[PDB]
Design a protein around this ligand. Structure first.
Ligand SMILES: *[C@@H]1O[C@H](CO)[C@@H](O[C@@H]2O[C@H](CO)[C@@H](O[C@@H]3O[C@H](CO[C@H]4O[C@H](CO)[C@@H](O)[C@H](O[C@H]5O[C@H](CO)[C@@H](O)[C@H](O)[C@@H]5O[C@H]5O[C@H](CO)[C@@H](O)[C@H](O)[C@@H]5O)[C@@H]4O)[C@@H](O)[C@H](O)[C@@H]3O)[C@H](O)[C@H]2NC(C)=O)[C@H](O)[C@H]1NC(C)=O
Ligand code: 7HR
Ligand code: CL
Ligand code: CL
Ligand code: K
Ligand code: NI
Ligand code: NI
Ligand code: NI
Ligand code: NI
Ligand code: NI
Ligand code: NI
Ligand code: NI
Ligand code: ZN
Ligand code: ZN
Ligand code: ZN
Ligand code: ZN
Length: 759
């Protein structure tokens, strides 16, 4: 038919139309007018009207809402938004008929965090949002640090494993299809799981501007269309809008992050922001719209002379398919492949040299913090590549100088966040956080109930002036038991030859959030929650001051029937044991005899003891010195389905030979002290400092190439790699930490999401 008066309505005339659709025949005539450019010059200030022009420099254009963004500035004399000083926005100065403040999401591709320190009069509009608004030093993307998984994470509050968009390129073996950046397949909705903000909003009655733009639509027009939509009738006007830009990522790829040619792109991007901000100013909405400026990921120096090649480690590379780049995802090219040997492949990639620039991993063995396993679309073998490098098949694979996609805790991959407007705080500086968290935030701004996500709702209230959500601490589902002396040393046939709570449990007992049965067990130097179902402790709290054998005794508070026994570990060639509270840190020889209790013991592979012994005898003390005492809480994890969630007993696939003692996949530790370190851990009266890790429980150390040398050359390096958020351990244990503190519960939520990166 025609687009007589329907340009970008919310025969087709909408945003996705110039992309594998046919659009109405007149759609370029009417909608993509581009005559006489975008910015008004003094030349046109009178100018009678004209349908052919991009925008209009007439003295009636305000009423139409089809002015150029610089009309009120050039012709009527006012100033750009960027030159005006900044008042506080104590509440929204929105026009009548505005139900809430609109949200405008401004997404920039590859805007590395550090760019903010570059740019004085390169980015004067952005610097002004930054400084007047709520900002953080940096923002952490999800892994992989690639465009599609992050924008969809940002849309959904979900990790990639859950929303399905697991990379720019991927292969679903069940659709038997391939998803790509180029192509029409990605427009099939089957690939896109979860609930994105724009569907959440519409399902609750809040209109949304369509987030995607066809490629053939210039930036300046995307802006104008937004400002046009804002002027629509109230009933039709959206509350949430978004703008995505391919820059500065493109340039970054040509010239690298820190090139000389990057200034220009960053100027171009401030301009488009300025246009947005003079456009808002014009319609009288610059003290009314909520503005988020965010990136999808950072950008690193990557050149093709730094490329490792599979053909140097594998003799027949033509039989496998590699998604190459800044990660590797390996699989069989053919589905009939007899000579395909995943074990042989992982063998031939593992520490063939000291300084190898990638490390192979079955997907269930990567660090848990990446949340990168648990989707059939993630290949089993997966390569983690070193910063500044690349991976490829043969030499057959220089143009590019920057790239991204690395492990999301590396610095160059960190990206930006600024929130400016009525609901956001004023000139305030919140600590760094993760992008999964923002779906909840955007939900709150619009007053939406968020879909279940992987953001911890309440962890980011400290950004907002005005909070709908008051986070309620989860109720406990299993009350513990406090056994006294209930049994006699002689009942036990195990075969084994041989002021507590106030000091060792500083934040209250962890709450068990699933149905099980456990007992609290006090001792002098530590305390524990002992699972009668899993036959070892779910947790073990203790505290070490700054100044701080094969015997196994049975514990008379616990039935022999709910206890482990030495004769299994004696019968399992591959399995030994260790303790969760170490004997080496014993306040007394007498007290030492509790450390050897069977209730304190746990299954450990000998290759793991090396690591664990080193953590307990060396590191905890080292930390204790460094941090003014520490409170440790270690325990075990069962995630045989690698879904990131605590397993039921029927999930466990390994036991100690002939027993019902479950073998953990990982062991955790949460280590806490006072932020203000000059106070000692046990007598802290203020904010907390937490660090934590989830060490994979492996029968070999093939992941650590330097494990031939002494523990002090490699264990800490392993531990830094498996660092974790407390919340990450909560999911894996179904426990709940930090419940009795002097701190408000939103702040404990922020401490629970913190991750020590080790930059
Ligand atoms: C991060 O937060 C998410 C969201 O809460 C958590 O994932 C949820 O976990 C629960 C508990 O295991 C699962 O519950 C099950 O749900 C099904 C029914 O759910 C189906 O339909 C709903 C439709 O409204 C949908 O949410 C689900 O979507 C999944 O499945 C699709 C394919 O079948 C897929 O397109 C989509 O991307 C998503 O796949 C991912 O999850 C599935 C597991 O469901 C998994 O196969 C795959 O590896 C992907 O990771 C689903 O269709 C009930 O019948 C069950 O009894 C049970 O209640 C939710 O399904 C699940 N939802 C999502 C979106 O992941 C994560 O566990 C959490 N992770 C962490 C670490 O905290
Ligand atoms: C990378 C550019 C891009 N290109 C496409 C193409 C197609 C799509 C697809 C269109 C259809 N949707 S969907 O219908 O909602 C899927 C519905 C699934 N449910 C039925 C389960 C899928 C997304 C997204 N693209 C995107 N993407 C990814 C975008 N995300 C944002 C975005 C994101 C967040 C921001 F806060 C700002 C912007 C701009 S664009
Ligand atoms: Cl799926
Ligand atoms: Cl404030
Ligand atoms: K036994
Ligand atoms: Ni800062
Ligand atoms: Ni092969
Ligand atoms: Ni005994
Ligand atoms: Ni041993
Ligand atoms: Ni040691
Ligand atoms: Ni102390
Ligand atoms: Ni705190
Ligand atoms: Zn990107
Ligand atoms: Zn692929
Ligand atoms: Zn890119
Ligand atoms: Zn699990």
């Amino acid at each position: 038919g025609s687009c007589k008066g329907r340009c970008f309505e919310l025969c087709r005339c909408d945003n996705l139309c110039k992309s594998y659709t046919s659009c109405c025949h007149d759609f370029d005539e009417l909608c993509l007018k581009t005559a006489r450019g975008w910015e008004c010059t003094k030349d046109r200030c009178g100018e009678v009207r004209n349908e052919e022009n991009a925008c209009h420099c007439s003295e009636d254009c305000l009423a139409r809402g089809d002015c150029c963004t610089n009309y009120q500035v050039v012709c009527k004399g006012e100033s750009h938004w960027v030159d005006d000083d900044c008042e506080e926005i104590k509440a929204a100065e929105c026009p009548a008929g505005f139900v809430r403040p609109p949200l405008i999401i401004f997404s920039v591709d590859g805007f590395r965090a550090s760019y903010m320190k570059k740019g004085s009069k390169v980015m004067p509009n952005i610097e002004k949002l930054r400084s007047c608004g709520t900002h953080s030093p940096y923002m952490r993307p999800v892994y992989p640090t690639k465009t599609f998984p992050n924008l969809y994470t940002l849309a959904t509050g979900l990790y990639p494993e859950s929303h399905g968009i697991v990379g720019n390129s991927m292969y679903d073996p069940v659709f038997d299809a391939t998803f790509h950046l180029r192509g029409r397949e990605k427009f099939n909705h089957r690939w896109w799981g979860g609930q994105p903000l724009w569907i959440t909003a519409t399902k609750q009655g809040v209109k949304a501007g369509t987030f995607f733009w066809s490629v053939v639509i210039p930036h300046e027009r995307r802006i104008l269309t937004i400002l046009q939509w804002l002027t629509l009738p109230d009933h039709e006007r959206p509350s949430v809008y978004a703008f995505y830009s391919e820059q500065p990522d493109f340039s970054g790829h040509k010239y690298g992050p820190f090139g000389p040619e990057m200034t220009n792109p960053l100027r171009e991007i401030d301009k488009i922001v300025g246009q947005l901000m003079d456009g808002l100013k014009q319609l009288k909405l610059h003290r009314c719209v909520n503005v988020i400026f965010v990136g999808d990921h950072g950008m690193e120096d990557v050149t093709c002379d730094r490329t490792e090649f599979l053909s140097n480690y594998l003799t027949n590379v033509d039989d496998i398919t590699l998604v190459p780049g800044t990660l590797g995802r390996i699989r069989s090219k053919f589905s009939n492949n007899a000579k395909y040997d995943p074990k042989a492949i992982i063998a031939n990639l593992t520490c063939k040299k000291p300084d190898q620039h990638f490390k192979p991993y079955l997907k269930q063995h990567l660090p848990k913090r990446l949340h990168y396993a648990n989707n059939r679309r993630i290949e089993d073998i997966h390569l983690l590549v070193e910063r500044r490098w690349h991976v490829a098949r043969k030499p057959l694979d220089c143009f590019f100088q920057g790239d991204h996609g690395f492990d999301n805790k590396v610095n160059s991959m960190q990206t930006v966040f600024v929130g400016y407007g009525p609901t956001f705080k004023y000139k305030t500086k919140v600590p760094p956080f993760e992008n999964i968290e923002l779906y909840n935030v955007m939900c709150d701004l619009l007053g939406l109930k968020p879909a279940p996500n992987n953001g911890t709702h309440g962890s980011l209230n400290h950004l907002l002036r005005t909070n709908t959500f008051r986070p309620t601490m989860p109720e406990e589902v299993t009350r513990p038991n406090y056994p006294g002396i209930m049994y006699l040393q002689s009942d036990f046939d195990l075969g084994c030859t041989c002021s507590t709570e106030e000091r060792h449990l500083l934040y209250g007992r962890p709450a068990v959030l699933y149905r099980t049965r456990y007992d609290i067990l006090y001792h002098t130097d530590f305390e524990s929650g002992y699972s009668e179902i899993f036959l070892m402790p779910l947790w073990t709290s203790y505290t070490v001051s700054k100044q701080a054998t094969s015997c196994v005794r049975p514990d008379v508070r616990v039935s022999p029937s709910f206890s482990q026994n030495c004769l299994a570990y004696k019968n399992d060639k591959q399995m030994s044991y260790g303790f969760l509270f170490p004997p080496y840190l014993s306040s007394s020889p007498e007290a030492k005899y509790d450390a050897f209790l069977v209730t304190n013991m746990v299954p450990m592979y000998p290759a793991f003891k090396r690591v664990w012994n080193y953590f307990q005898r060396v590191l905890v003390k080292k930390y204790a010195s460094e941090r003014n005492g520490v409170n440790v809480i270690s325990g075990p994890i069962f995630d045989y389905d690698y879904d990131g969630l605590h397993d039921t007993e029927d999930k466990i696939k390994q036991y100690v030979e002939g027993s019902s003692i479950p073998v953990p996949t990982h062991y955790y530790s949460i280590i806490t002290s006072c932020l203000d370190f000059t106070q000692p851990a046990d007598k802290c009266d203020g904010p907390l400092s937490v660090s934590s890790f989830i060490l994979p429980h492996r029968p070999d150390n093939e992941e650590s190439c330097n494990s031939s040398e002494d523990e002090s050359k490699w264990v800490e390096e392993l531990m830094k790699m498996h660092t974790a958020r407390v919340r990450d351990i909560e999911h894996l244990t179904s426990l709940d930490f930090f419940r009795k503190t002097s701190r408000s519960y939103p702040e404990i939520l922020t401490l629970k999401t913190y991750l020590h990166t080790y930059e």
